[PDB]
């Protein structure tokens, strides 16, 4: 999504987490978007089944 | 035109170029063994 690395663990075993809050959020906002697209997507299938 | 709970001013004398190290969020020296600020800080530095 933007980041360094899309592993976690790498960025809690890199930075300072007074930085790595910069790298995480941008995780975040990845992640919680994609989850929000197929959570609407399943409601849909549900209102059609 | 804020209003604060109280104030509170620290001083000490350090070498000159190391005032870089002053600021939160940075390690080095001072920032290490001798003065440390929290990340969140509130407040200025000043120095001359």
Same mark, same amino acid.
């Given at each position: =999504?933007? *980041? ?6 790498? %960025? ?6 007074? +930085?790595? +809050?910069?790298? %995480?959020? #941008?995780?975040?906002?990845? #992640? ?11 409601? %849909?299938?549900?209102? +059609?089944? | 035109?804020?209003? =604060?709970?109280?104030?509170? *001013?620290?001083? =000490?004398?350090? #070498?000159?170029? +190391?005032? #870089? ?8 020296? %001072? *920032? ?8 969140? =800080? ?7």
């Amino acid at each position: =999504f933007g *980041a360094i690395s899309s592993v976690l663990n790498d %960025i809690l075993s890199r930075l300072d987490p007074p +930085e790595a +809050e910069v790298q %995480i959020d #941008r995780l975040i906002t990845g #992640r919680l978007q994609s989850l929000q697209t197929y959570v609407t997507q399943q409601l %849909i299938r549900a209102a +059609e089944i | 035109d804020l209003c =604060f709970t109280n104030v509170y *001013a620290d001083s =000490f004398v350090i #070498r000159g170029d +190391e005032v #870089r190290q002053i600021a939160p969020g940075q390690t080095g020296v %001072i *920032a290490d063994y001798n003065y440390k600020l929290p990340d969140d =800080f509130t407040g200025c530095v000043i120095a001359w």
